Design a binder for this molecule. Structure first.
Ligand code: ZN
Lengths: 222, 641
């Protein structure tokens, strides 16, 4: 047996594009993959519970191409929250013109096309060989979390839960924060501790996690 | 000095060492291996076995690892299992006769001398699937753990090469030499000298019994990019009708090799040798999960009894543990302690867990004289907001249940559910393969994303949910089989983020009857509020606070082992017959709840029978109806709308 694109990926990464155009079969498979790291098949000789252990990274576009500022994301987007709940993170990257930012946006694009060398900042991005060496080394640890951060995480979870449920049931509201949201926050704080290369978690990381979580959708209000 | 060519094994020295270890072993492992009353661990088996006339015996590896004078025997039985066991087959009888010397007995000696003996090393060193078996380590005692897919017929083998001389009214006898027969072409020169006049007859000869089993390997670790495989093996006589489809197995054997012919025409072989495995023992049960229904397997029980092969089929009990069980059943906090114990790593979900445990209890298994059958199984459905422990609970149930399969979404079809026909890769012949619906025959069937699954596939379950009997009519196959499996699956809500102010019987994207016929359903709506969220948050963060949740044992949580043994004994030993008092509450509860079909009556009775089975009651009583109706109404949350 040789598996499909997901199976050839394991303890690694996967990429997908135009998710809205995929079939309900793909939706059913990825739904099971995202939360549980197995796969079930009952077609033929194959009756396996195959191990995926894969990381999913999809992308798509709205129903109308450009955003609908007069409709909520929960309606403009085509995917259902019944599945999107498993998506611990979600960004809404839409564009509105502005006189100043596009100046240097065009500057950057023109420079990179003039020559592949990225802007000549006093900075040297490094080879993916070294990046993979670093990520492999950081993957060796398995840090721990204290109670001083646990209680703050619980308080923030309660805050977000109540605020989103009672207040965010309106124009710019997407569903509600979930236990999966809490688990993702915890996992990302663990990743931050791994990057710092310490076997303990500091209170200085949950702040970053929640900051990014609530900044993912800042543009929805402009 | 006595030794074997190219070997470091001694016959008489090994015999003496084996006898010394046998005479001297008293739970040495409880002392050396760990800190954990009794005496002479081994000797009891041999003392008791004599009167029952059995030519079998089991054997561990940890005992040799523990005793002082068996460490070297360890590697010698490892490298040369067949030779060491052939030595042991004589050493065991030597010890038997040297132990009878201290006893006077009635004249049973006519049997032991003519008898034989064999061993079965079962709990041995671990092996990492088949990837580890590079050709350096061939022909050695090995262990594995996998499930069963396909079983083949009986292969006879020439064991007594009879021969018929054409003249001189004489027969002839000759035996096999390392797996070949050399027919003596001559004709017993003395009486007659015809150098090539003899014949062959099959009815006279003796035959051996062999099987071949296709197995699916289920390791504990796999490399980056692994996928399932299939292996073939060979069992031999006295082990037939032991392992088949629908059983998880931990096994032992001996990796080997063999070439195959290039045709049925001449002797030209392949430079590559097809591998295989020859069995030494099969372990049919384990500690981390209960066992098969006892009434479901009565015919096989009696068949094995008659065949005098008694490999384990059901776990055995101890009187002290039975008394402990009766003591634990005395207290009244069982009804919530079981729920707290099923999943200590999750928030309460009290009624969900209680229903899961009642399903594991199962219920009632009655039959009529010829035209009835009513099995213990109540189909269960889940539904509610995502981002909860529904999938975790389902995976837990699949792990803990012995006989079940996992199916996901629309990746399934009627052909791959019921029986389907395929071809073998070696014999090149039309051979079948069992379907996932039948593989779980007795136990659990898990589904997720029950909504998007294809309508074609959703059609089949109508009859499974009723008579537990699938039917097949396709190429060369006409038979109706049995699928006593149970159903336990999740469902997703219509649209997304749910709709509070709408009838939920129409808020699922699923037709009425398919949902109504479910025996019981559970609802996982959100209802966000403190006093139910901060507690959960700490409950789940303290899981990670430790490297592994062993501090979770606080708050009165039982161990898995005693719980499972209690469940198995209760399942196998008690049969609560329906009572009279429960009628006047059951009928009224059903009628009042109709204000949505008669299947909920069957659901309620089958769940009240499981409740009566709990507490070890041999009789139903009125209270079970109360709990059943109250829990049904709470599960559907009648008070809301
Ligand atoms: Zn003759």
């Amino acid at each position: 047996l040789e598996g499909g694109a997901l199976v050839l990926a394991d303890n690694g990464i996967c990429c997908i594009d135009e998710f809205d155009k995929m079939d309900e079969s793909d939706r059913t498979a990825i739904h099971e993959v995202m939360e549980q790291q197995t796969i079930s098949i009952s077609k033929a000789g194959i009756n396996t519970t195959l191990n995926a252990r894969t990381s999913i990274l999809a992308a798509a576009n709205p129903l109308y191409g450009r955003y609908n500022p007069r409709l909520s994301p929960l309606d403009n987007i085509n995917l259902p929250a019944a599945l999107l709940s498993r998506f611990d993170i979600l960004f809404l990257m839409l564009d509105i013109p502005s006189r100043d930012d596009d100046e240097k946006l065009a500057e950057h694009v023109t420079y990179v096309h003039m020559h592949n060398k990225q802007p000549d900042l006093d900075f040297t991005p490094v080879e993916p060989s070294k990046m993979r060496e670093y990520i492999a080394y950081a993957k060796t640890k398995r840090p721990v979390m204290s109670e001083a951060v646990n209680d703050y995480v619980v308080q923030a979870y309660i805050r977000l839960r109540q605020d989103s449920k009672r207040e965010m049931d309106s124009k710019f509201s997407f569903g509600q924060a979930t236990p999966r949201t809490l688990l993702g926050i915890i996992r990302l704080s663990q990743a931050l501790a791994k990057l710092r290369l310490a076997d303990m978690v500091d209170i200085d990381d949950v702040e970053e996690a929640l900051r990014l979580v609530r900044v993912s959708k800042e543009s929805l209000y402009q | 000095l006595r030794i074997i060519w190219g070997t470091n094994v001694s016959i008489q020295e090994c015999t003496t060492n084996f006898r010394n270890f046998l005479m001297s072993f008293k739970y040495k492992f409880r002392k050396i291996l760990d800190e954990r009353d009794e005496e002479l661990y081994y000797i009891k088996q041999l003392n008791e076995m004599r009167e029952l006339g059995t030519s079998n015996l089991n054997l561990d590896a940890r005992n040799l690892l523990a005793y002082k004078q068996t460490e070297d025997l360890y590697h010698q039985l490892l490298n040369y299992p067949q030779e060491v066991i052939s030595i042991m087959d004589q050493t065991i009888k030597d010890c038997m006769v040297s132990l009878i010397v201290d006893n006077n007995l009635d004249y049973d000696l006519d049997e032991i001398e003519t008898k034989f003996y064999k061993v079965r090393p079962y709990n041995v060193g671990s092996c990492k699937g088949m990837r580890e078996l590079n050709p350096n380590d061939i022909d050695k005692l090995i262990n594995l753990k996998g499930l069963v897919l396909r079983s083949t017929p009986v292969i006879p083998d020439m064991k007594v090469a009879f021969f018929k001389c054409n003249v001189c009214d004489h027969t002839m006898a000759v035996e096999i030499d390392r797996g070949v027969i050399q027919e003596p072409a001559r004709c017993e020169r003395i009486d007659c000298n015809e150098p090539n006049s003899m014949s062959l007859i099959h009815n006279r000869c003796s035959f051996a019994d062999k099987q071949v089993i296709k197995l699916q390997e289920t390791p504990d670790f796999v490399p980056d990019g692994q996928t399932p495989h299939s292996i073939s093996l060979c069992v031999y006589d006295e082990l037939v009708d032991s392992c088949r489809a629908g059983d998880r197995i931990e096994v032992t054997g001996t990796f080997r090799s063999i070439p195959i012919r290039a045709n049925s025409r001449q002797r030209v072989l392949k430079s590559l040798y097809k591998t295989y495995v020859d069995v030494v023992h099969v372990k049919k049960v384990s500690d981390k999960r209960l066992d098969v229904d006892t009434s479901t397997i009565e015919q096989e029980l009696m068949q094995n009894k008659v065949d005098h092969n008694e490999v384990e089929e059901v776990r055995q009990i101890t009187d002290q543990d039975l008394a402990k069980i009766r003591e634990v059943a005395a207290r009244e906090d069982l009804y919530s302690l079981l729920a707290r114990s099923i999943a200590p790593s999750i928030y309460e979900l009290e009624d969900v867990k209680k229903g899961i445990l009642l399903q594991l209890f199962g219920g009632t298994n009655k039959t009529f004289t010829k035209g009835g059958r009513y099995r213990g199984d109540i189909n269960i459905l889940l539904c509610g907001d995502p981002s909860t422990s529904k999938s975790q609970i389902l995976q837990y149930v699949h792990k803990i249940t012995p006989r079940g399969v996992y199916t996901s979404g629309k990746g399934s079809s009627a052909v791959g559910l019921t029986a389907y026909i395929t071809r073998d890769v070696d014999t090149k012949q039309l051979v079948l393969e069992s379907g996932a619906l039948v593989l779980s025959d007795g136990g659990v069937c898990c589904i997720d994303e029950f909504d998007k699954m294809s309508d074609s596939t959703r059609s089949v379950l109508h009859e499974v949910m009723e008579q537990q009997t699938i039917s097949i009519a396709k190429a060369g196959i006409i038979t109706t089989l049995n699928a006593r499996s149970s159903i336990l699956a999740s469902a997703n809500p219509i649209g997304s983020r749910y709709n509070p102010n709408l009838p939920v019987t129409e808020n699922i994207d699923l037709p009425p009857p398919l949902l109504s016929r479910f025996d019981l359903v559970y609802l996982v709506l959100d209802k966000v509020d403190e006093k139910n969220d901060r507690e959960l948050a700490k409950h789940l963060t303290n899981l990670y606070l430790e490297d592994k949740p062993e501090h979770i044992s606080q708050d009165d949580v039982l161990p898995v082992e005693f719980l499972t043994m209690y469940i198995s004994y209760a399942k196998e030993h008690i049969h609560p017959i329906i009572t009279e008092a429960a009628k006047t509450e059951l009928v009224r509860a059903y009628v009042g709840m109709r204000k949505a079909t008669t299947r909920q009556l069957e659901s309620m009775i089958r769940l009240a029978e499981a409740h009566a089975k709990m507490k070890l009651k041999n009789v139903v009583e009125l209270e079970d109806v109360q709990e059943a109706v109250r829990l049904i109404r709470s599960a559907i949350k009648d008070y809301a709308t």
